[PDB]
Every structure is written in C-alpha cells, then in structure tokens.
Amino acid sequence: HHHHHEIGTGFPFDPHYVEVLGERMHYVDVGPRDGTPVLFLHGNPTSSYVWRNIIPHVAPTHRCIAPDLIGMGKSDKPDLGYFFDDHVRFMDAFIEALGLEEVVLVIHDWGSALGFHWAKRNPERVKGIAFMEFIRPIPTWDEWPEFARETFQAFRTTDVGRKLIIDQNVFIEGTLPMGVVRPLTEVEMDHYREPFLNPVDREPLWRFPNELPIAGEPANIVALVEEYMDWLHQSPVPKLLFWGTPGVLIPPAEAARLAKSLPNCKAVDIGPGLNLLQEDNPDLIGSEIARWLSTLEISG
Numbered sequence: 631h632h633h634h635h636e637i638g639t640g641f642p643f644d645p646h647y648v649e650v651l652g653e654r655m656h657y658v659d660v661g662p663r664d665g666t667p668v669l670f671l672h673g674n675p676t677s678s679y680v681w682r683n684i685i686p687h688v689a690p691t692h693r694c695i696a697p698d699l700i701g702m703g704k705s706d707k708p709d710l711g712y713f714f715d716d717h718v719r720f721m722d723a724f725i726e727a728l729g730l731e732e733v734v735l736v737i738h739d740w741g742s743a744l745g746f747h748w749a750k751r752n753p754e755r756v757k758g759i760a761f762m763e764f765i766r767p768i769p770t771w772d773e774w775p776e777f778a779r780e781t782f783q784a785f786r787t788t789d790v791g792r793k794l795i796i797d798q799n800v801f802i803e804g805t806l807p808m809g810v811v812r813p814l815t816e817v818e819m820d821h822y823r824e825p826f827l828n829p830v831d832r833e834p835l836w837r838f839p840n841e842l843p844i845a846g847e848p849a850n851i852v853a854l855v856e857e858y859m860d861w862l863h864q865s866p867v868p869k870l871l872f873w874g875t876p877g878v879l880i881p882p883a884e885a886a887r888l889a890k891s892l893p894n895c896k897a898v899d900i901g902p903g904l905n906l907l908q909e910d911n912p913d914l915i916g917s918e919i920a921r922w923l924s925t926l927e928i929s930g
C-alpha cells in the first residue's frame with residue numbers, strides 16, 4: 631500500500647507559435663496583456679527552459695515572453711548556418727511579428743548579444759535591461775577562462791570542432807553541465823537534450839562558439855559587440871546585472887567594474903554560480919527582477 635505526501639524541473643507553459651520569416655517559432659507567453667512586456671532571451675545551448683523558474687516571479691505583474699531562438703528549443707529548424715546574423719534577423723522579425731513596442735529585456739549568453747544589439751538599434755523602445763553572463767569582446771585567449779581554453783580552441787575548428795559538438799554532442803553532454811554549480815538532474819538534462827536528439831540539428835550549437843568575439847575573430851562579430859558595449863556605457867537605460875562566484879564569462883571583479891562604468895546599473899550577487907546562473911539561484915534572480923521592475927515606475 632501507499633500514502634500520499636527543490637528547484638523546479640517542470641516546464642508548465644502552454645506552447646505559443648508565431649510564423650517568422652516563413653518559419654515557426656515557439657515562445658512562452660504568460661502574465662497580463664497590458665503594460666510593458668518582459669522579453670527573455672536564452673543563449674547556447676539552452677532554450678526558454680532556462681527561464682522556467684524565473685518567469686513565475688515576474689508573471690504576476692508583467693507579461694513574460696520567452697522565445698526559443700530559431701533552430702533551438704521547440705522552434706523550427708531550417709537548414710541555416712545559424713550565424714549570429716541569422717539569429718538577429720529572426721529575433722528582429724519575431725519582435726515585429728508580435729507587434730511589441732516598448733520592452734524590458736532579460737538576457738543571457740548569446741541572448742545578451744541579441745538583446746544588446748537590438749537595444750542599440752532601438753534606443754527609444756528599451757525600458758530596461760537585466761543581464762548576466764553576457765557576450766563581450768575577448769581581446770586574447772588569456773582573457774578566456776583557463777579551464778575552457780583548449781576546449782573552445784578545439785570547438786573553433788571545422789573537423790575537430792564539429793566532431794565534438796555535432797557528432798558527440800559535447801556542448802550538451804559536457805559543456806552545459808560545467809556551466810552549473812549544482813548537478814543538473816536527469817529530467818533537466820533531458821529537457822536540454824530534447825531539441826538536439828538528431829545530430830544534424832546541432833548546427834547552432836557549433837556555430838555559436840565559432841561566433842564568439844575572441845582574439846579579433848570573427849572580425850564582424852567583434853565590431854558588432856564593441857559597438858553595443860560602447861552604446862551600453864553611454865545609455866541611461868536602467869540596468870540590472872546578476873553575477874556569481876566564480877562565474878565564467880563575467881567574474882566577480884568584472885561585475886564590480888561594470889556596476890560603476892555602466893550608467894544607472896545595479897549589480898546583484900547570486901552566490902555560487904558559473905554560466906547558467908538561472909539554474910543555481912532562480913528564486914533570487916526572479917525575485918530581484920520582479921522588484922527591480924517595480925522600481926522602474928518610481929520617479930524619485
């Protein structure tokens with residue numbers, strides 16, 4: 631006989647779809663219909679799943695929109711190279727397809743590059759940006775985390791890199807768990823694996839690290855990233871920066887610097903964390919975003 635009697639693993643959000651440049655994109659859409667929407671953008675190799683435990687904190691007061699990038703999550707998977715340029719084109723068109731006007735961004739990893747680049751080009755529409763573990767220029771390999779130098783150098787080759795990421799699914803099975811301090815459960819791993827069970831679908835997982843602005847290459851990405859970082863230092867847009875210890879892309883020392891150099895910026899320590907801060911302390915991140923959103927309406 632039986633009797634009846636943690637960081638959430640479920641994804642209790644109804645699928646929403648919109649046609650974007652002839653392809654179907656999936657997104658979470660919850661919360662009130664009026665007011666300024668909060669747009670959550672994930673990076674590599676995740677999906678809207680990464681926001682699952684953060685969104686419920688914001689949804690009571692704001693619309694939350696969390697798309698899966700083209701070729702990822704539940705969005706369609708056209709035969710693209712999935713360059714950053716492709717993601718930009720699709721994300722621009724997604725935002726237009728939903729008829730969004732002003733927005734608040736919550737962005738992470740490659741999602742931050744998309745968010746920052748979009749904000750730079752749409753200064754009058756951005757009402758706030760929350761960000762963490764974001765893409766910035768990496769002048770030399772010495773400025774890349776030591777533990778991942780050899781690995782990412784290998785990733786950034788055609789034959790070896792594709793064998794690792796596409797054939798062996800290393801970014802999902804290897805790199806992903808290394809971006810979280812706590813161990814991911816099998817249920818969580820399965821939600822992350824889901825979009826990429828078919829090896830040929832793993833193209834964006836390989837192109838993304840090959841797009842990273844490292845040692846001047848790719849030059850186009852480096853220029854673009856420098857441009858939005860320059861814009862960011864000059865914009866009065868409200869900013870909220872989450873960081874963890876030791877972090878990965880944004881070490882604590884770097885978070886302290888940005889908190890001062892970026893105008894109108896608040897920085898929040900999430901405790902232990904690497905790249906996927908959302909997976910180590912989603913309640914703090916969600917709570918702080920919800921409260922920060924409230925202060926955006928306070929004049930002073």
Ligand SMILES: CCOc1c(C)cc(C)cc1CNc1nnn[nH]1
Nearest residue numbers: 674778805806808809838839878905
């Ligand atoms: C230094 C390794 O850092 C990472 C770790 C340890 C884990 C994950 C998931 C991601 C990254 C990095 N971000 C990333 N790489 N290519 N596209 N986005």
Ligand SMILES: [Mn+2]
Nearest residue numbers: 651652653654
């Ligand atoms: Mn179509």
Ligand SMILES: [Mn+2]
Nearest residue numbers: 709710711833
């Ligand atoms: Mn192809």
Ligand code: NA
Nearest residue numbers: 816817819820
């Ligand atoms: Na399993």
Ligand code: NA
Nearest residue numbers: 679821822824
């Ligand atoms: Na999934």
